[PDB]
Design a protein around this nucleic acid. Structure first.
Ligand SMILES: [Mg+2]
Ligand SMILES: [Mg+2]
Ligand SMILES: [Mg+2]
Lengths: 145, 157, 109, 242, 121
RNA sequence: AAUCCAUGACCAAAGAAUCGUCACAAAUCGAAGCUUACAAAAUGGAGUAAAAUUUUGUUUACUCAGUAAUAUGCUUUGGGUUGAAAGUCUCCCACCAAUUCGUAUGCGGAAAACGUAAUGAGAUUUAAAAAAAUUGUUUAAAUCAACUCAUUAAGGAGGAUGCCC
RNA sequence: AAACCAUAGUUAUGACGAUUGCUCUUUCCCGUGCUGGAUCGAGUAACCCAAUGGAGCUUACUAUUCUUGGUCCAUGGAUU
RNA sequence: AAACACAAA
């Protein structure tokens, strides 16, 4: 038999909330201003605890009990703000709605969570991440001109 | 066609009319890739359309290669250019000239360059716009091997 | 007969001729009918034809891998071939109740 | 492609002039929208039914997309549309649509009383009908008027942004969205993002999962969100031009 | 007069055929882009450097379009060469009632100009 | 004893099909395909319109392949595939006018702890089941049904018997 | 240093919507009947799941947890 | 997980 897994790829995007400063309107400029960096106070257990709190706060008791059976963060590094969340094929919608309803980190505010790719294996997730990273470099090279 | 774009700059051109685009290519894209001031080259411009006679074009080309005087030391380069579907006839005329010239135990040295015009059309729906690319092939043929022109972006052939 | 639109043929398939009243609908479907989203649109009501329009049977129905579509090898009547002013022909399966559109080309074998 | 048609404009009446900070925040929000991935943007402008409409044609729209957003339209590569909602309470000081329907593209309404629902279902040439999801819905949504307004072509708009503001109004928003989903029978449901700040913007996957957990099937979500929004935009354009 | 045209002689050993796309007149644009990307990814596993893109006749225009796409879209060095292609055509010569296909076949040469387009990684 | 009705036990066959939908010059939970490069316009194509030139020749402005291609689209199918994907079962997936199972041995079959056909017998008192694999029960032991083992080499001709005739 | 190859191909084989058909039950009509027709309703099973391909054998399935065909010196009731 | 073995149990 096989345990049906479904990994979730999410991105942490920081909107440049600053109305006093004028900004450049282009593709790579806003891509760089949205993918600047993640703060130092960012780890796996700090994001897992936050998502576990938000799950109980939005869904409830049974909604967190059914979802927290196989809720783990397999791969995440704070340099690129890319994480892979493992869950069931039944509770994928719950985890996606919780990642959408993520308000803020307990000490860091002003950020959004974007679910990009959902798949049932890590190899296709890695391939899609490599493809996205390769696509990102194109607009950068084009705008550096 | 809603508009014509070259070098991320909008221009006032028309794809169906060959005269305006050929004059624009002769006046703008060639000076942006080769400079005739800092050297001693005699550049002969020639654009090819699909309605031109191949034999008359070759009879013009074999004369355009020996127009300048040879005593003072002028290197004579002829630059042929076209765009769109006329590039096929351009290549045909270039190959026929090569075949008719190389027979006399001589050699023609060639440099190639390929760029693109960016045109915009209205898509199937009203909320979609398609972006088409028109190729531009510019070739420089000369009897001498070394040319002081800025030919680093070309292709030696 | 080759399929120009969504559809998969099979062996022992029925070949019908396009009628005269709904002749512009199939032409517009073969030209193009898209959605406001942008993609194609074939989720519409099909003009089911009559019964006395069967002019052939497909003997070799298999998905053509050399062109990317459904190739149908059938045998149509010459009188019905001269009857129509167009090369458009409908294809149907033996269990399926859908009619696909295509165009046929002569084979000299 | 995606369509967002509920971006609010920081201006309620005609008297109050907009500031540079509000325009900058709107630019931030639209850039965040384009960053998350969108194709069509239709900013909304709220006005009251009692406020005096000006007797002009070239002054009805205090937006002027061509001089303000026309440069962003050329650079970042998106489009903008004009949309106005009608906050209607009482059948008085009205009876004028032939001039407000030609200037703007999409005409919406916001009924807050039981008579407002009747006036919206009977004698309004509108395309979308929206409710105050933040506060309580006026009396009760029934199938009687909803069916008669959906069979002609008017859809119901759901603002998933209103939930992201506070914690208390989330309960009312959920109790209203489930009510309108149960009443509309899940045919004419369009979704919009009523956020004025870039910190309340989400993607397609999260919104789809939210609306699915709220009571809408998976096919209905995509089919509506895409095709019904595109068709509403096309109908608005046709109403403006011919 | 009835005359048929056969393809041109192709002598490729084992790997010139692999990293080479022959653009037909009926070949779509997006399928050509997909095949070119696959060839570009499989070249360094085949052990070559560039990808050949060969087209003659009507497909020359869209072959140059394919080249101009990867010219600036992916910023990859392209090389354009102009070559000659000889094609043999079987023609019928006049010399009861026989089949049109089963007649006197004579071979005739025809030269056409074509463009080879190499793309680097 | 014949027929019908209802239950139970046992043997055998198969595993319903059709349509639509799901953002990103790439995508999807995934997959494959749309590449023997030409529209006989390369025997240095076919013609029209103006100037000048004592016709040729030359410079400008156009027509012809029209069933024309239409820009990350488009078509197809995917967990029992000519029923068990399950199983610590067997075998093929180089050859050998021959130390190489040279095996004309009931039939089919390349082989198979492989299918089936006619007759006789058998039950820890038996050829072998009880006090290699598989299976919860795991052949029988009034009769039937099921398992095991022991014999029956292919084709042509003559005579006898039984049936329609 | 590759031989990389599946009209599923390597922990994938998704998500709902719609249509016909199949089994019983509460109804009306022609001719008794007829894979005769239409409403009020219930259910679409289980064993279980590929990892290179084919054949044989054995072993798990179908009780309101879909079905189908035949047999029985099995019993139960009735006529001759 | 699957798939493999004159293993191991
Ligand atoms: Mg297995
Ligand atoms: Mg196993
Ligand atoms: Mg196995």
């Amino acid at each position: 038999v096989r345990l049906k897994s479904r990994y979730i790829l999410f991105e942490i995007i920081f909107p440049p909330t600053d109305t006093n400063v004028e900004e450049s309107v282009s593709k790579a400029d806003i891509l760089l201003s949205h993918h600047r960096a993640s703060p130092a106070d960012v780890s796996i257990k700090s994001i897992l605890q936050e998502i576990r709190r938000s799950l109980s706060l939005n869904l409830g008791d049974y909604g967190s009990a059914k979802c927290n059976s196989l809720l783990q963060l397999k791969y995440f590094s704070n340099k690129t703000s890319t994480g892979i969340i493992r869950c069931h094929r039944e509770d994928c919608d719950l985890v996606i709605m919780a990642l959408m309803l993520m308000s803020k980190i307990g000490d860091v505010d002003g950020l959004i969570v974007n679910p990009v790719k959902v798949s049932g294996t890590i190899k296709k997730i890695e391939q899609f991440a490599m493809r996205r990273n390769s696509k990102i470099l194109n607009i950068i090279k084009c705008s550096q001109s | 066609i809603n508009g014509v774009y070259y070098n991320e700059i909008s221009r006032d051109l028309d794809i169906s009319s060959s005269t305006q685009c050929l004059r624009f290519l002769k006046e703008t894209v060639i000076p942006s890739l080769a400079n005739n001031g800092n050297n001693s080259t005699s550049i002969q411009y020639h654009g090819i359309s699909k309605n031109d006679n191949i034999k008359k074009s070759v009879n013009k080309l074999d004369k355009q290669i020996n127009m300048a005087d040879r005593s003072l030391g002028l290197q004579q380069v002829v630059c042929i250019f076209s765009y769109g579907p006329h590039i096929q006839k351009m290549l045909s005329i270039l190959e026929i000239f090569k075949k008719g010239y190389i027979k006399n135990n001589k050699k023609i040295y060639q440099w190639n360059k390929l760029t693109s015009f960016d045109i915009k059309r209205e898509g199937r729906n009203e909320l979609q716009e398609e972006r088409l690319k028109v190729p531009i092939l510019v070739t420089l043929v000369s009897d001498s091997e070394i040319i002081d022109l800025n030919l680093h972006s070309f292709t030696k052939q | 007969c080759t399929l120009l639109e969504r559809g998969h043929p099979k062996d022992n398939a029925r070949i019908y001729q396009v009628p005269e009243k709904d002749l512009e609908h199939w032409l517009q479907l073969a030209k193009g009918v898209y959605r406001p989203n942008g993609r194609k649109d074939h989720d519409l009501k099909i003009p089911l034809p009559e019964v006395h329009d069967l002019i052939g049977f497909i003997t070799s129905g298999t998905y053509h891998l050399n062109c990317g579509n459904g190739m149908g090898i059938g045998f149509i009547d010459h009188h019905a071939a001269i009857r129509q002013p167009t090369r458009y022909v409908l294809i149907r399966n033996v269990g399926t109740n859908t009619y696909r559109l295509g165009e046929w080309s002569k084979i000299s074998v | 492609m995606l369509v967002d048609l509920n971006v609010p404009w920081p201006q309620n009446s005609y008297a109050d002039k907009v500031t540079s900070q509000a325009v900058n925040n709107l630019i931030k929000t639209l850039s965040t929208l384009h960053m998350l991935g969108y194709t069509h943007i239709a900013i909304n402008f709220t006005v009251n039914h009692s406020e005096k409409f000006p007797n002009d044609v070239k002054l009805l729209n205090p937006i002027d997309i061509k001089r303000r957003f026309g440069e962003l339209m050329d650079r970042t590569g998106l489009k903008l549309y004009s949309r106005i909602t009608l906050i209607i309470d009482d059948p008085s000081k009205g009876q004028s649509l032939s001039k407000i329907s030609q200037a703007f593209d999409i005409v919406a309404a916001l009924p807050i009383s039981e008579k407002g629902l009747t006036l919206s279902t009977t004698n309004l040439d509108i395309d979308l009908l929206t409710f105050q999801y933040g506060s309580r819905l006026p009396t009760f949504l029934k199938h009687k008027s909803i069916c008669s307004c959906v069979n002609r072509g008017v859809k119901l708009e759901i603002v998933y942004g209103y939930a992201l503001r506070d914690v208390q109004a989330r309960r009312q928003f959920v109790s209203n969205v489930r009510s309108v989903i149960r009443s509309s029978r899940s045919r004419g449901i369009v979704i919009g993002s009523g956020a004025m700040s870039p910190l309340e913007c989400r993607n397609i996957l999260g919104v789809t999962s939210l609306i699915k957990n709220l009571g809408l099937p998976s096919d209905r979500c995509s089919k509506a969100m895409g095709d019904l929004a595109s068709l509403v935009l096309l109908n608005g354009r046709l109403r403006n031009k011919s | 007069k009835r005359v048929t045209k056969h393809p041109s002689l192709k002598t490729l050993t084992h790997k010139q055929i692999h990293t080479t796309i022959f653009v037909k007149s009926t070949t779509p644009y997006v399928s050509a882009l997909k095949r070119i990307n696959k060839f570009l990814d499989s070249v360094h596993k085949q052990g070559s450097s560039y990808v050949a893109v060969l087209g003659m006749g009507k497909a020359v225009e869209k072959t140059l379009a394919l080249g101009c796409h990867f010219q600036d879209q992916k910023n990859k060095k392209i090389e354009v060469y102009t070559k000659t292609i000889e094609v043999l055509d079987e023609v019928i010569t006049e010399g009861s009632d026989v089949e049109d296909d089963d007649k006197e076949t004579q071979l005739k040469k025809r030269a056409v100009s074509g463009v080879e387009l190499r793309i680097y990684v």
